[PDB]
Design a protein around this ligand. Sequence first.
Ligand SMILES: Cc1cc(C)n(-c2cc(N3CCc4ccccc4C3)ccc2[N+](=O)[O-])n1
Lengths: 365, 29
Amino acid sequence: KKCKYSFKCVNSLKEDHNQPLFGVQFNWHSKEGDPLVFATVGSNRVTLYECHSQGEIRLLQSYVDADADENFYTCAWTYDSNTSHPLLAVAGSRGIIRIINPITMQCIKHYVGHGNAINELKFHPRDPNLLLSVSKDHALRLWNIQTDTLVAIFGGVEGHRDEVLSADYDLLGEKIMSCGMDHSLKLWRINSKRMMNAIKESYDYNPNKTNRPFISQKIHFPDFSTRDIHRNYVDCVRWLGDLILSKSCENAIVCWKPGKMEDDIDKIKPSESNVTILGRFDYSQCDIWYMRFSMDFWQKMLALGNQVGKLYVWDLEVEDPHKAKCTTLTHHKCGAAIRQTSFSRDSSILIAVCDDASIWRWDRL
Amino acid sequence: SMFSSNRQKILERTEILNQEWKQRRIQPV
Ligand SMILES: Cc1cc(C)n(-c2cc(N3CCc4ccccc4C3)ccc2[N+](=O)[O-])n1
């Protein structure tokens, strides 16, 4: 078939700090009818905005980190499992995870532990307390933010050999795929008996009942590993059902899967030496490092910004990636690199953030 | 096809997540 999706640029603004914006996320936890909110991170700032009619972007609150040398690279939304209150986790160059109350912009709690910069944060899709961080220290870490424990460290003997740049949970939250500067993509199952038990123990941990500190799992071995997809750093990975989307600097997002064509993802052996490349979503002028692609909630659209301010969009319901391409979103004033984009939960709005601190709003026609 | 089987898996799994979101009442920001 062909793509039908059309957008219109309705507004733009520039943050006064003039520093690159690396991350943008709409809050997908807000209930139907409630206002559409998104956060941006860059420099030592976290900024919240609300989307209103006629393309209005309303500034809500600004968070300025006490450390002027901090560079936030990522953010992720969650909610407090008890009070239903929204929460925002942010991290970057210092390698500290800060949990912010978005209503007040106060740092509620922080987590130190990574040896270096945190490149990405992801919350578990079923459990709001399970936070994953990926780092320049070559490891991923799984945190339980209800008990303030480090559940597991994914790294070591057969872990990444260079910075981990990205990771994603699958839809049901049974596994994680990570990727990084060592050109590899690695699978880490979290539905194993070992990991399910480690998660259960992180919840049983009561500090005002024991003097011993919590013991984290050290997961040295992934459930699948490949260096056969890309020929350089892998800076973005996402699950597409049982398939994987990943990118390097080759001006393509590759769709692939572990094993041979018919192999079940849940029957893949840790020693599996084969991969199957299923297709490529081709684009141009996105050969610089650290550019993320995004999908909408329903995984019907794929978006990626390039180094010159173009925003590519594909329809994932069209089998051939070449016939899946939608009209590239361009504005003559949008000329800086688009680091990340985010769709609103209903896919009605697409926000793009840039290296020149600009924010771009595209409404779905 | 591998395509239709994969889209169906996305459809059923996103539905499970959407039903969990629907039962939640997260306070606005
Ligand atoms: C001054 C400056 C320019 C840039 C590009 N950085 C930058 C950003 C990140 N991020 C943010 C965006 C991103 C996107 C994909 C994967 C990982 C990441 C992590 C990491 C390292 C650097 N660094 O080179 O220090 N710093």
